[PDB]
Amino acid sequence: MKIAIAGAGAMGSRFGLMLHQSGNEVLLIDGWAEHVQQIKEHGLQANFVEAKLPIVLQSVDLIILFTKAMQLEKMLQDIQSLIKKDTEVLCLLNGIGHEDIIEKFVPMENIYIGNTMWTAGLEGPGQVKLFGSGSVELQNLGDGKEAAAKKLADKLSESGLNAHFSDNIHYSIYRKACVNGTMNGLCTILDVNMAELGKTSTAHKMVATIVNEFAKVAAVEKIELDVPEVIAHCESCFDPETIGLHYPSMYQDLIKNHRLTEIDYINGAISRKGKKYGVATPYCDFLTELVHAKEDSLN
Amino acid sequence: MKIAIAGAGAMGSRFGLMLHQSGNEVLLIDGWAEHVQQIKEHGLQANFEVEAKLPIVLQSEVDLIILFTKAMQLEKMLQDIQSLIDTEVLCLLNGIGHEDIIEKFVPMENIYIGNTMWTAGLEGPGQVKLFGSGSVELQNLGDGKEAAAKKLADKLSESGLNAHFSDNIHYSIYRKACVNGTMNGLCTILDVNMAELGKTSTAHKMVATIVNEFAKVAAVEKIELDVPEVIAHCESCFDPETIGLHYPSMYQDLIKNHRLTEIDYINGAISRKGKKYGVATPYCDFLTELVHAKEDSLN
Ligand SMILES: NC(=O)c1ccc[n+]([C@@H]2O[C@H](COP(=O)([O-])OP(=O)(O)OC[C@H]3O[C@@H](n4cnc5c(N)ncnc54)[C@H](O)[C@@H]3O)[C@@H](O)[C@H]2O)c1
Ligand SMILES: NC(=O)c1ccc[n+]([C@@H]2O[C@H](COP(=O)([O-])OP(=O)(O)OC[C@H]3O[C@@H](n4cnc5c(N)ncnc54)[C@H](O)[C@@H]3O)[C@@H](O)[C@H]2O)c1
């Protein structure tokens, strides 16, 4: 496979690299000049390791979207050239509702949305830390493309990304967004990692409240979350054995690297929909308002 | 007057000292052994720079008792001084609903609740910083005790505490608790002072939301806040000219001194009442949960 990764940040770089290591032709596409230049010159360095991946500024058979949700539109705009008739598009971004923009730019038949449990940290231009284990879930939005989705899952799993087809996917995106709509904001705002958060006495109440707001909105979309499971899934992160000692990626984005979060595409999406469906979502509203206020307090 | 001050912390000490200075017989009562011992030995030192040896007793052992504990010590303090209760009780604590506990221990005829705008910092055992100007508002609970309330206001004003009778009082307590239910939690959780907070883009929305939750509950108590004014009164604190550059007292309690907050007697009280009266108060619920989680994250 010839593969573009549009957004070879932290997570884009994880994937880019594992696909080039198993012997795909990987082309990274990024918007960050220094990262690019650095990688043209010295390759991509990682603590999983070096690899000279081809890389191009933004201004193949498979394109894999891995921008932040907020760059995503401009990135599409800047790569519409590579969106040909054959050409498959995969979103594994962490929020909710990316399909809507992706649709503007790529035929429905060719779009595949999903989730990943893989992690990754971008230490600096050209440099990444590649944490632990992981998995992928993905499904096709296009009519009767369930078979090519299973091949895409299969091609990816062959590079060790351990990916699976899903017949729900919107269940799975909501279920994961709940994890992103709790651990993230909470850790960010409270200045704690996940383990410390679950040690506090109100974490459970806060998590449950939030999960319910997510589930009432999803229900409107005919998507019925097993709320006790989803809650136990969010609470799973409290475990110091597993990921407990890590800070979630939103904390990293803002508190560690002084960059904006994806909060509008997670808890904020839930609010946008609460408005539209007439469902109260105050905890998402406030959590969103809190994170933006926190952004403003630092930049 | 013979006067006990039950809770001769920062604020209790301010009052204790100004009432002794104008010539009242003041007995401090406190629960903090070192503070006591220190004041038995060296008196009370204050940077108003002045000293006074005030009689002071641990709370295992007058005409007017003045409650000035933190709202969380309050019950145990009552319990420990029921002996001293014709016996006259004043609350000037910062939360809401202290009448209910005070009632258990003292006849209704004798209870007077209120507010103060005086400030005071306790630097260490036996030591206080006493900052700038202030005032008091108070009223009687107790049928037809309007006249003794005006004397109490008068006796206090004669020591320079500049106190006034009020015929609303429950308006005035709620109106102030709004300011305490916003600047406090928000500063504490965001790690910003007030000026920085009002600079952020979501401070106004967060404040307005909260004030409204305060005003819907108050309404059920037949108390009708002028919400725009109360909001402008909370937002007044954003001004760097006035108090903008200060951190509020809850921030000081927890972030600076690693001591618990009064959040359950402010935003928490609003939530306890929301439950009762069937009024949604999620922003107070969540702000309360956030501050407790924060407490737990530090101990
Ligand atoms: N990193 C994680 O562990 C994690 C986990 C699951 C899902 N995801 C999802 O992956 C998507 C991307 O995550 P990510 O870790 O790559 O974010 P990331 O910022 O590392 O990179 C996203 C993109 O950001 C650009 N970027 C990063 N720093 C930049 C800078 N300083 N200037 C200009 N552009 C810059 C990158 O170059 C890349 O374009 C997000 O939706 C995220 O939620 C991330
Ligand atoms: N301090 C202010 O400027 C201020 C202003 C307006 C209203 N108030 C209200 O008045 C009430 C009294 O407030 P405050 O300023 O005195 O509380 P404070 O904590 O300074 O003192 C109150 C009690 O806490 C105890 N305490 C303080 N430090 C301690 C320590 N290190 N170890 C053990 N015990 C300790 C004190 O001895 C005293 O018993 C509060 O509800 C507050 O909201 C305070």
Six-digit token pair at A260?
């904006």
Contacts of A138 (CB under 8 A, 6+ apart): A90, A92, A112, A113, A114, A115, A149, A152, A153, A163, A164, A165, A166, A169
Q: Is the dihedral of CA A48, A53, A55, A60 positive or negative?
A: negative
Q: Give B292's contacts in chain A (Cβ within 8 Å).
A: 200-202
Interface test with B, best of A297, A298, A299 (most B CBs within 10 A): A297
- Among B197, B209, B296, beta carbon nearest to A200: B296
What are the angstrom distances between the C-alpha of B165 and each of A208, B65, B157, B177, B198?
A: 46, 18, 11, 19, 32
Q: How far is the CA of B68 from the centre of ligand 2 (A)?
A: 7
A138 and A112 Cβ atoms separated by less than 8 Å: yes
**Cα A237 to averaged position of ligand 1 atoms, centre (Å):** 21
Residue A123 tokens read as 């230490």
Q: Whose CA is nearest to atom 5 of ligand 2?
A: B119
One domain for residues B17 and B156: yes
Residues 6+ apart with CB under 8 A from B182: B206, B207, B210, B211, B234
User: What are the C-alpha distances in Å from A286 to residues A270, A283, B58, B195, B210?
Assistant: 12, 5, 44, 20, 10
Q: How far is A166 from chain B (nearest CA, A)?
A: 35
Q: State whether the beta carbon of B130 lies less than 6 angstroms from ligand 2.
A: no
Angstroms from B242 CA to nearest CA on chain A: 20
Query: Which residue in this structure is represented by tokens 């989680």?
Result: B293
* Half-sphere exposure for A287 (CA within 13 Å, toward CB): 37
Cβ neighbors of A144 (< 8 A, separation 6 or more) are none
Count the neighbouring beta carbons within 10 Å of the beta carbon of residue B184. Answer: 28
Whether residue A18 sits in one domain with residue A125:
yes
Atom of ligand 1 nearest to the CA of A265: 41
Residues A149 and A173 in one domain: no
- Are residue B179 and residue B272 in the same domain, yes or no? yes
Give yes or no: residues B282 and B175 share one domain: yes
Pick from A188, A193, A291: which is nearest to A247 by CA? Answer: A193
Q: How many CB pairs under 8 A join A and B?
A: 86
Domain termination residue (choose one: A167, A196, A214): A167
Paired residues of B47 in beta bridges:
B129
Q: Is A297 on the interface with B (CB under 8 A)?
A: yes
**Distance between CA atoms of residues B129 and B235, nearest Å:** 26
CA B141 to CA B169: how far, in whole Å?
Answer: 10
Among chain A residues, the shortest Cα distance to B205 is held by: A289
Pocket test of ligand 2: the residue of B32, B259, B261 to mutate, having most ligand atoms within 8 Å of its CB, is: B32
- Relative to beta strand B111-116, strand A111-116 is unpaired
| The residue to which tokens 């991946």 are assigned | A53
Same domain, B127 and B204: no
Rounded CA gap, B80 and A7, in Å? Answer: 66
Name the domain boundary from B142, B167, B192: B167
- The answer to whether residues B14 and B152 belong to one domain is yes
Measured CA to CA in angstroms, residue A242 lies from A131, A235, A237, B132 at distances of 12, 12, 7, 53
Q: In terms of DSSP bridges, do strands A163-165 and A55-57 run parallel, antiparallel, or are they unpaired?
A: unpaired
- Structure determination technique employed: X-ray
Per the CB < 8 Å rule, is B283 touching A280? no
Best residue in B297, B298, B299 to probe A by mutation, most A CBs within 10 Å?
Answer: B297
Residue whose CA is at the smallest distance from ligand 1 atom 28:
A9
* Statement to judge: residues B49 and B179 lie in one domain: no
Q: What is the CATH number of the domain that holds B20?
A: 3.40.50.720
* Of B111, B109, B156, B119, the residue nearest B137 (C-alpha): B156
Residues A24, B256: Cα–Cα separation, whole Å: 55
Residues making up chain B, counted from first to last: 299
> Which residue of B189, B191, B283 is in closest CB contact with A282?
B283
Domain that holds residue A212: 168-299
Contact (CB, 8 A) for A12 and A64: yes
Q: What is the largest CA-CA distance in chain B?
A: 53
Resolution in A: 2.8
Asked whether residue A175 falls in the same domain as residue A161, the answer is no
CA atoms within 13 A on the CB side of A122: 23
Judgement on whether residues B156 and B261 belong to the same structural domain of the protein: no
Burial A6-24 (b: 16+ CB within 10 A, else e): bbbbbbbbbbbbbbbeeeb
The CATH code of the domain that includes A193 is 1.10.1040.10
A10 labelled ligand-binding:
yes
Pairing of strands A136-140, A163-165: parallel
Rounded to whole angstroms, the Cα distance separating A183 from A238 reads: 9
CA distances to B13, B91, B94, B97, B111 from B173, in Å: 22, 11, 8, 9, 15
The end-to-end CA distance of chain B, in Å, is 41
Q: Please name the residue of chain A whose CA is at the shortest distance from the CA of residue B213.
A: A282
Same domain, B162 and B29: yes
The total number of residues shown for chain A amounts to: 299
SS (H, E, C) chain B: CEEEEECCCHHHHHHHHHHHHCCCEEEEEECCHHHHHHHHHHCEEEECCEEECCCEEECCCCCEEEECCCCCCHHHHHHHHHHHCCCCEEECCCCCCHHHHHHHHCCHHHEEEEEECCCCEEEECCEEECCCCCCEEEEECCCCCHHHHHHHHHHHHCCCCCEEECCCCHHHHHHHHHHHCCHHHHHHHHCCCHHHHHHCCCHHHHHHHHHHHHHHHHHHCCCCCCHHHHHHHHHHCCCCCCCCCCCCHHHHHHHHCCCCCCHHHCHHHHHHHHHHHCCCCHHHHHHHHHHHHHHHHHC
* Last residue in a domain, options A148, A167, A186: A167
Q: Do A202 and B296 touch (CB under 8 A)?
A: yes
Answer yes or no: do B51 and B160 share one domain: yes
Annotated binding site of B for NAD(+): 10-11, 30, 70, 73, 94, 120, 259, 262
Number of domains in chain B: 2
Determine the residue type at A1. M
Q: Is A203 on the interface with B (CB under 8 A)?
A: yes
The Cα of B219 is separated from the nearest Cα of chain A by a number of Å equal to 21
